[PDB]
Amino acid sequence: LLTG
Amino acid sequence: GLETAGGVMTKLIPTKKNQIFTTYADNQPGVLIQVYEGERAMTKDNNLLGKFQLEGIPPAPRSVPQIEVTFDIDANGILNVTALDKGTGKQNQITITNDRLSKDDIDRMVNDAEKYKEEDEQNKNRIEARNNLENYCYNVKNTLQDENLKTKIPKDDSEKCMKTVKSVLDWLEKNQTAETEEYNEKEKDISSVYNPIMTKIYQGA
């Protein structure tokens, strides 16, 4: 997962 | 490497490499790529070389989008990081020049990793527990309300479990960072209610  | 969910350092002479990533949240319009480099497993400990954000990501669920981040390093050492949306084909890139760390500063950083990264592995494991429960809550809620076909489950058991999941979601918001055991305790408390429902579904033979 990657954050904004 | 780069920063992933929960401020985690995800590691990626001449070499080129790639890895696939997804969205942390639903209808995420963009992804911020943060480049941290160092021996220590934690992103925070490692020096940030550069940050770039991809935008124009189509609205989609939490794990659906596919983003490929390719890091290209030639004999010169100049780092070229490119993030590409598999679906849209839209991409963004940054270039970090090789032109200032000293040999002993690097060796000191490597030595620090050996001594301190042992404690880092424990921190990493603790963070992973947060992500796993987060995902578990989403999946259980989705299963209870997902299938219209899966309405067969008794109303009483569904209501009771939904409330338990809701209470953990609220607890998760309030407690941004908690101990590994606390997360597992919460997972186990949801698991205690949900597992009997699942067994009952397949119990019928």
Residue numbers in the entry:
A (entry chain H): 4 to 7
B (entry chain D): 433 to 444, 451 to 537, 540 to 645
From the paper:
P. falciparum also exports a single heat-shock 70 kDa-class protein chaperone, PfHsp70-x, to the host cell. Hsp70-class chaperones play key roles across the kingdoms of life in protein quality control, protein translocation, folding and assembly of complexes, and preventing protein aggregation. The function of Hsp70-class chaperones is linked to the binding of exposed hydrophobic segments of aggregation-prone proteins, ‘holding’ these and facilitating their correct folding in a catalytic cycle driven by ATP hydrolysis.
PfHsp70-x SBDβ (residues 424–539) is made up of eight β-strands arranged into two β-sheets of four antiparallel strands, and is connected by a short loop, Lα,β, to SBDα (residues 540–644). SBDα consists of five α-helices, which first cape SBDβ and are then arranged into a C-terminal antiparallel three-helical bundle. The contact between the SBDβ and SBDα subdomains showed that our crystallographic structure corresponds to the closed state of this substrate-binding module. Complex formation buried ∼567 Å2 of solvent-accessible surface area on average in the three PfHsp70-x SBD–substrate copies where all peptide residues could be resolved; thus, the complex interface accounts for nearly 50% of the total accessible peptide area. However, it should be noted that the NRLLLTG model peptide may not capture all of the interactions formed by the true substrates of the PfHsp70-x SBD. Thus, the SBD of PfHsp70-x is structurally more similar to that of human Hsp70 than to E. coli DnaK.
